Design a binder for this molecule. Structure first.
Ligand SMILES: O=c1ccc2ccccc2o1
Length: 121
């Protein structure tokens, strides 16, 4: 759920999901359309696509458990949906950590109309 995901984000990046990643670019927070604005926005695009592969699951509210072995995020086994949502989130968190050096504040509260172009998953 958005509860575990936000906790991963904070531990990885040191930033708070809201509002650091809830209104960033074209895909972080609104789901959305357009061409990802940067690496971090690409993390969100892929994350959205990951959730998109789980039609019969509920990522926002289904809670899962995860632990950290040597700092590494480890998804604990739960239901099938829980295992897969965790992996989707785990990947986004790492992706965010990997692109921290490039995170830009000019993309916060990005206006919707500036999100143009297309990109399928
Ligand atoms: O798209 C979202 C995702 C999570 C969330 C949590 C609190 C308030 C607003 C939110 O919007």
């Amino acid at each position: 759920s958005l509860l575990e995901f936000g906790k991963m984000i904070l531990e990885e990046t040191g930033k708070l999901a809201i509002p650091s990643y809830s209104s960033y670019g074209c895909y972080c927070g609104w789901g959305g359309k357009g061409t990802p604005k940067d690496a971090t926005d690409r993390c969100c695009f892929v994350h959205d696509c990951c959730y998109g592969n789980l039609p019969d699951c509920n990522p926002k509210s289904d809670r899962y458990k995860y632990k950290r072995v040597n700092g590494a995020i480890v998804c604990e086994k739960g239901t099938s949906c829980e295992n897969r949502i965790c992996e989707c989130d785990k990947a986004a968190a790492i992706c965010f950590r990997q692109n921290l050096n490039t995170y830009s504040k000019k993309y916060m509260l990005y206006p919707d109309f500036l999100c143009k172009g297309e990109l399928k998953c």
